[PDB]
Design a protein around this nucleic acid. Structure first.
Lengths: 74, 302, 94, 82, 96, 105, 96, 78, 93, 104
DNA sequence: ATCGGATGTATATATCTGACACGTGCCTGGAGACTAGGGAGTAATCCCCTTGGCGGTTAAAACGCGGGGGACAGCGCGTACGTGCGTTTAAGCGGTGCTAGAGCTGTCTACGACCAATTGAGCGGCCTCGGCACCGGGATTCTCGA
DNA sequence: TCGAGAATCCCGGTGCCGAGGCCGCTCAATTGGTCGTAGACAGCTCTAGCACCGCTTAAACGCACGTACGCGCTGTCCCCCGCGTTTTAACCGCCAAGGGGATTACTCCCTAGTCTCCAGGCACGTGTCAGATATATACATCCGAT
C-alpha cells in the first residue's frame, strides 16, 4: 500500500509498503530514493517520536497517511 | 533631615531623593539624574514644558534652596496639570509605550540607582531592536543576562508574551532583583506600560532548561569568554530549536563561508545561515534555522 | 620494490569535500611531501618533549601540547577539537 | 587587578636603547610603534612559555622552559643552562 | 652661558653606552608587564627571578637588532633620522 | 578483523602511522592513544588545504587541480601562510600584485 | 607612425608574467652553469634531470623574492627604480 | 659560462616581482648573488652525494641539502 | 641530587692555552651552554644522515661527513684534521 | 686501568660523551670511533673560542674573562660569526660601530 | 685657521670586600673480559638511464637610434626636536612573615614491547576515454594624439 | 573631448595522453595472549615567591628656546625603453655506446648486553686576592671671540 511522507519544505515523497515491514527497511528505501542517511532522519507522527525497532503496523500507519520527517544532525 | 519630594503625575508614590546626593561615579551624581528626569518629563508633556518655560532658569546644583525652588515649581505644575485634567483638557494617555529617549532615561535611572559600588551598551541593544523585529509570537531569553538591561529594554519596547533573564553570579543577580523592583516602581511613577517579565536564578544547562530553550524562539548570548565546553553544550541545545527561530551572539557558531559537504555533516552550520550584523555608527552575528539547505544539498547529490 | 607513498588516502579524502574533481600527478606528489613535512615537524616537537621532562614515552597527552605549539591559533583550536573528538571515539570499541 | 602597564617603558628608556643601536636623533612618532613591537614580541614568546609550562602540570614557570620556548622560534640564547 | 652644539651630546651618549654592558630598562615595570600578559593567557601564575632576567635579556637583544637595522634603513634615503616608515620597511624583510 | 581506521572513524591510515613512529626513533615507547590523534590532525589539515584549492580551481573554470591553484590557495588565506612561511611550492608562481605607486598617474 | 608611452607595455607584461606559470631562464645554459660550478668540489660528476629542474625551481623563487624586497625598499626612498645599493640593503638586512 | 643568464632573462625574473624600470648596473650584482647562492647549495648537495659512496647527485639529495638552509622544497619527494 | 656540567673540562683546557687567565661563574655556564648547543646540533645532523641512507649505526664516517656540512669552511677543515689525527691514538694502543 | 681519554690524547671526557650519545634515541647503535671524534671536534672548537677570548681579555687589563670579552672575541672574527649568527650571548652588548655619515 | 676657557675623560693611588681556587670525603658511573648474534662490508649482475653527437626551424637574443620621463643638485621655509634647568615620583634597597608549591622516595598496577599465525588491505601493471591544449573568427578592451 | 589600431577575450571544433577503474597479487596490519618496568599516585621536607613597609635619590618629567633639518620646488641632462632589423643557438627529435644504480647471496666481525671492580667528578667548606669604589689630578676635545 501507498503512504506519503511530508517533509518541511512543501515536497511530498511516496512509497508502496506493507504494515509488516520494519521501520529500518522503510528508511533504506528512502535512502535509495533521496540519499538521506537513516541515522540523520527523524520521522514524527501525532506528537510521538517514532522508534526504529518496531514494525510499520505498530504505529497504526495506514494507506493514505501524512507523516512528518524532520532532519537532525549527528 | 532635609528631603526633596516630587509628586507622581498619576498619583502614585512620590519620587524621593535624599539630601546630600549620593555619588555615583567621577562624572555622575543624583542632581544629573534629577535634571534629566525633569527635562524628559517636560518632553513627555508639552503642557509641562510650557509651564516650565515661564519662571528655564540658572539651576545651581550646589544650593539646596535653588533645587527645592525648581522642585516646588515642578510640583505646583503637576498640581495644575491635575486641575487641567479636571477641566476640559484630555489627560495624558495612559499605558502607552515610552519613547526611545525615555527608555534610555528610565534604564539609566535604574542603573544609577542600582550599581552603588562587562555591560552591553544601550545603543547596541537599540540597533539590535531596529534590525531583529520582534512580534507577539516571539519569546526572548538572555542566557547569562548580566545586570539584565537588555531584557528590560526588549521588555519595554516589544509586545512578546513573556521575557526571562537568568543570571548565575550572586552579586549581579542580586542587583537585578533591585533593578526589577526599581523599574516597576518608576514605571508606576511614569504610568507607562511594558510587557510582563521575570528574572530567575538558575543554571540554564540543566535538563529542565532543555525544553525551555527548545521552545524559545529568540536567544541572545554573549558567549565571547565561555570557552569550548560551554559553547559545545550550547550548540547541542540550539540544535533542538523550532523552525524560524533566531539566535544573536557575539561569536559565530559557524564560519561565514560555510559550505555543506559529506565531511562537515555534524557542524551546526548545516542547519543555519549566518550573516554579520551591520556596525553601529564588538561584532554580533545572527543565525537562522533553515533546514531547506540540507534538503537542497541532498537533492543535488542525486 | 613496493615503494610506499601517501597517495590513495589523499585521493579518498578529496572526494569527501568535493563530489567530483581531479588532481594531477605533480600536485599529488606536492601533497605527498607536504604531509611528510607536517609529520616530521610534529614528531620532532613531540620527541623534544621527552628529554625536556625526563620521561621516555610519547603518549596521547603529548602530541596535543605539541600541536598547539606549532600551528597558529584558529587552526590550533580546530586541531585540538578534532583530535579529542577522534580519541574519545576510539576507546568505545566493542 | 592590573591595568595598562605598557606605559612603564619610558620615553628615555627607548631613547637609550636606540642609542645602543646607533641612531643620532629620534622623531616624535616612534614611541607608539616601539611599544607595539615590544608587545607583540612578548606576547608570542610568553604564550609559548606558558604552554611549555602547563604541559607538565608545574603551575610555575621556570627559566629553563623560557629558554626552550625561545629556542622554538629560532632565537636561541645561552647563559641560563639551556 | 655655556652650551653645546646640538648633535654631539648624542654622540657622547653613543660612545658611552656602547662601552658599558648593563641592562637598560628599569626592572619593576618589566616584571609588571610580564605579570599582566601572563594574567591574560592564564589565571594566576608565579614567576621565578631567573626567567624574568632571561626574558629581559632576550627582549633587549631583539630591540637593539631591529633598531640598528632601521638605522641602516633610514640612511638609505638621504635622511639621518628614523621614522615609522623606516621601521616598517625594516619589518617586512625579516618575515613578519 | 576490523581495521584501526574504521574503529576510529578516520580516513588516514592509523596503522601505517604507528609503524613509522616505532622505527623513527623518537622515543622508546609509543602509547596506544598516540597514533590516532596525530592522524586526525593530519586529516583535518589535508581537508582544509584541498577545500580552498578546489575553490581556486573552480574559479578558473577547470575541473582538474594543477599546482598553481594549490599555490594560490594557501597565500590568499592569512592563517596557512605562516605555516608555509619558509616553503616554496614548485611550479607555483606568485600572487597578482602591483605596487600602487607604480600605476600610471 | 605609432608608438607607446614608455613603461606601459612593461605594465602589461607585468600582468602577463604574473598570470602564467612557466619557467623563466632558458634551460640549457642553466644546466651549463650548474655543471661548471660543480667542478670545484669533486671532479667528474654526472647529473640526473630531475635534480637540475628542481635546482632551477628553487633558484627561480629565490631571485623572485629578492627582487620583490628590493623593489619595496627602493619605493621607500621616493625613487621608482632599483639601483645596486638597494639590492645591497635588502641583502644586508636579511642575514647573509 | 655565467653569460648564459642574459639581460632579458634577468629582466623577466625582475618583472615577476614587480619592478617597472631597471638601470644599467643591476646585472653584475644579480649574477654575483646567483653565483654565491648556487655555490653554497651545490657544495652541500655534492657533500650529501660524496658521503654515501655514490658518484652521481640526485633530486632526493638536492632537496635534503636544501632543507638545512631554511628554504625547504616540496614537489620532488622528501 | 647532582647535575652534570661541562665545567671542569673547559677549566682544564683553559690551562693549555693561557697559564694566567681566569674565568667567572656566569662565564663558565655560558661556555657550558655553548658546548651543549654544538653537541645537539651536530648529533642532529648525525641522526638525519641515517634515514637519508637507511643505515642504522652512527659511525665515524657518518659524523665526519657531518662536520664538513655544518661549520663554514676553514674551522671545519681544522676540525676534520684534528679528528683524523684523533682516531689514530685510539687505535694506537 | 687507563681512561679512554688518555688513549686518544684528549682532554674532554670520552666516557661521558659515549653515555650521552647512546641515551637520546639518535641511533640504534653507536660505533667505537664516534664518541672520540666528536669529543675531539668539541675540544678544538672550545679551545679556539676560549683562545680568542683570553687574547681579548688581556687588552682591558683584566685577568678574569667576563662575558663582554667573550662577546667581543666571537664577532670580530669572520668565520666564527656565521656559526653563532642566530645566537645572542647574554650580558654581551654589541660591537662599537658608528655609521660614518653620522659624524660631525 | 688661531689660542684659550671649560668640561668631560683617563692614569695611578688606598681599601675593602665577596667571588674564586683548592683540599677532602665520598660514592657511582666508567673500564675489562666475554659471549652471541645480526647489521654491515664485499662480489656479481643487469639493465635503466646518462652522456655524446647530428640536422632544422625558429624563437629568442643581440644591436643601433630616437626621444622622453625620471635621477639628482640646489634653495627656501617652518616645524619639530635636542639641551638644559628646576620640579616631582616612584624605583630601588634592606628586612621580615609565610606559605603554596617544588621536589624526592615508596608501591603497585594498568599499559605497552614481544611473538606465532592470519589474511585482506594496499600496490604494480594494463586499458580506456574525456578534460583540456590548440586554433582561427569575430566581439570587447585600452591608450593615445588631436 | 574622442576614433584607429594593437592587444585581449568569447566561441567552437579537433585531437590527444594522462587520469582512473579493474585485476592478480603478496606481506604488512590484526588477534590473542605473557610479562615486565615506566608511570600514576599519596605523603612528606623545605625554599623561594610573594606581600608589605620604612626609607634615600636617581631618575622620570614639564617647559623655555634656539637651530639643524625634512620637505617641497625648479631645473637640467642623461640614460633607458621601444622597436625594427639582423645573427645565434635553443631545442626537438633522432640515434647509439656503456657507467654505475639497484639489487641479491654470503659471511664476519663489530657491538649491545652483563658482571665485577674501583677510581675520577661532586658537594662542601676554607682562605685569599681581583676588581669595584673613591680621588686628585693630568689632558683631549669642543665652542667661541676674532
Amino acid at each position: 500500500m501507498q503512504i506519503f511522507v511530508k517533509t518541511l519544505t512543501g515536497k511530498t515523497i511516496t512509497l508502496e509498503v506493507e504494515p509488516s515491514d520494519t521501520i529500518e527497511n522503510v528508511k533504506a528505501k528512502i535512502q535509495d530514493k533521496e540519499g538521506i542517511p537513516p541515522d540523520q532522519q527523524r520521522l514524527i507522527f501525532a506528537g510521538k517520536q517514532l522508534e526504529d525497532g518496531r514494525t510499520l503496523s505498530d504505529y497504526n500507519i495506514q494507506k493514505e497517511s501524512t507523516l512528518h520527517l524532520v532532519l537532525r544532525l549527528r | 533631615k532635609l528631603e526633596l519630594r516630587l509628586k507622581s503625575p498619576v498619583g502614585a508614590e512620590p519620587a524621593v531623593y535624599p539630601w546630600p546626593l549620593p555619588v555615583y561615579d567621577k562624572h555622575h551624581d543624583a542632581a544629573h539624574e534629577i535634571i534629566e528626569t525633569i527635562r524628559w518629563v517636560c518632553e513627555e508633556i508639552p503642557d509641562l514644558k510650557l509651564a516650565m518655560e515661564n519662571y528655564l532658569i540658572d539651576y545651581d546644583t550646589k544650593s539646596f534652596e535653588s533645587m527645592q525652588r525648581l522642585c516646588d515649581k515642578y510640583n505646583r505644575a503637576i498640581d495644575s496639570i491635575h486641575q487641567l485634567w479636571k477641566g476640559t483638557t484630555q489627560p495624558m494617555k495612559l499605558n502607552t509605550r515610552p519613547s526611545t529617549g525615555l527608555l534610555r532615561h528610565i534604564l539609566q535611572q535604574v542603573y544609577n540607582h542600582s550599581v552603588t559600588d562587562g555591560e552591553t551598551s544601550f545603543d547596541l541593544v537599540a540597533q539590535m531592536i531596529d534590525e531583529i523585529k520582534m512580534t507577539d509570537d516571539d519569546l526572548f531569553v538572555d542566557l547569562g543576562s548580566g545586570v539584565g538591561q537588555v531584557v528590560l529594554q526588549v521588555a519595554a519596547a516589544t509586545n512578546c508574551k513573556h521575557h526571562y533573564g537568568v543570571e548565575k553570579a550572586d552579586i549581579p543577580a542580586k542587583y537585578a532583583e533591585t533593578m526589577d523592583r526599581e523599574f516597576r516602581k518608576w514605571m508606576k511613577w511614569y504610568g507607562k506600560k511594558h510587557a510582563e517579565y521575570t528574572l530567575e536564578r538558575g543554571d540554564f544547562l540543566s535538563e529542565e532548561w532543555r525544553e525551555r530553550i527548545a521552545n524559545t524562539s529568540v536567544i541572545f548570548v554573549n558567549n565571547f569568554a565561555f570557552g569550548p565546553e560551554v559553547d559545545h553544550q550550547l550548540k547541542e541545545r540550539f540544535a533542538n530549536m523550532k523552525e524560524g527561530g533566531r539566535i544573536v551572539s557575539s561569536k559565530p557558531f559557524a564560519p561565514l563561508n560555510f559550505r555543506i559537504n559529506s565531511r562537515n555533516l555534524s557542524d551546526i552550520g548545516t542547519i543555519m545561515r549566518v550573516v554579520e550584523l551591520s556596525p553601529l555608527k564588538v561584532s554580533y552575528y545572527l543565525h537562522t534555522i533553515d533546514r531547506t539547505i540540507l534538503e537542497n544539498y541532498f537533492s543535488s547529490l542525486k | 620494490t613496493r615503494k610506499e607513498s601517501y597517495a590513495i588516502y589523499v585521493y579518498k579524502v578529496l572526494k569527501q569535500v568535493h563530489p567530483d574533481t581531479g588532481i594531477s600527478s605533480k600536485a599529488m606528489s606536492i601533497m605527498n611531501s607536504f604531509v611528510n613535512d607536517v609529520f616530521e615537524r610534529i614528531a620532532g616537537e613531540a620527541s623534544r618533549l621527552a628529554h625536556y621532562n625526563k620521561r621516555s614515552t610519547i603518549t596521547s597527552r603529548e602530541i596535543q601540547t605539541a600541536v598547539r605549539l606549532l600551528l597558529p591559533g584558529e587552526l590550533a583550536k580546530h586541531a585540538v577539537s578534532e583530535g579529542t573528538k577522534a580519541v574519545t571515539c576510539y576507546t568505545s570499541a566493542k | 587587578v592590573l591595568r595598562d602597564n605598557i606605559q612603564g617603558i619610558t620615553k628615555p628608556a627607548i631613547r637609550r636603547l636606540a642609542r645602543r643601536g646607533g641612531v643620532k636623533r629620534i622623531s616624535g612618532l616612534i614611541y607608539e610603534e616601539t611599544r607595539g613591537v615590544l608587545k607583540v614580541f612578548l606576547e608570542n614568546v610568553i604564550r609559548d612559555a606558558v604552554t611549555y609550562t602547563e604541559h607538565a602540570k608545574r603551575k610555575t614557570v621556570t627559566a629553563m622552559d623560557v629558554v626552550y620556548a625561545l629556542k622554538r622560534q629560532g632565537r636561541t640564547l645561552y647563559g641560563f643552562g639551556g | 652661558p655655556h652650551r653645546y652644539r646640538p648633535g654631539t651630546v648624542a654622540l657622547r651618549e653613543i660612545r658611552r653606552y656602547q662601552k658599558s654592558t648593563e641592562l637598560l630598562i628599569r626592572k619593576l615595570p618589566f616584571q609588571r608587564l610580564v605579570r599582566e600578559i601572563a594574567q591574560d593567557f592564564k589565571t594566576d601564575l608565579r614567576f621565578q627571578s631567573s626567567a624574568v632576567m632571561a626574558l629581559q635579556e632576550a627582549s633587549e637583544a631583539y630591540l637593539v637588532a631591529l633598531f640598528e637595522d632601521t638605522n641602516l634603513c633610514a640612511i638609505h634615503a638621504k635622511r639621518v633620522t628614523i621614522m615609522p616608515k623606516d621601521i616598517q620597511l625594516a619589518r617586512r624583510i625579516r618575515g613578519e | 578483523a576490523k581495521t584501526r581506521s574504521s574503529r576510529a572513524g578516520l580516513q588516514f591510515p592509523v596503522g601505517r602511522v604507528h609503524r613509522l613512529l616505532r622505527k623513527g626513533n623518537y622515543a622508546e615507547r609509543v602509547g596506544a592513544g598516540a597514533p590516532v590523534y596525530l592522524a586526525a590532525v593530519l586529516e583535518y589539515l589535508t581537508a582544509e588545504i584541498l577545500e580552498l584549492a578546489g575553490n581556486a580551481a573552480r574559479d578558473n573554470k577547470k575541473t582538474r587541480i594543477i599546482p598553481r591553484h594549490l599555490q594560490l590557495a594557501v597565500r590568499n588565506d592569512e592563517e596557512l601562510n605562516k605555516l608555509l612561511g619558509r616553503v616554496t611550492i614548485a611550479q607555483g608562481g606568485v600572487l597578482p600584485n602591483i605596487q600602487s605607486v607604480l600605476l600610471p598617474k
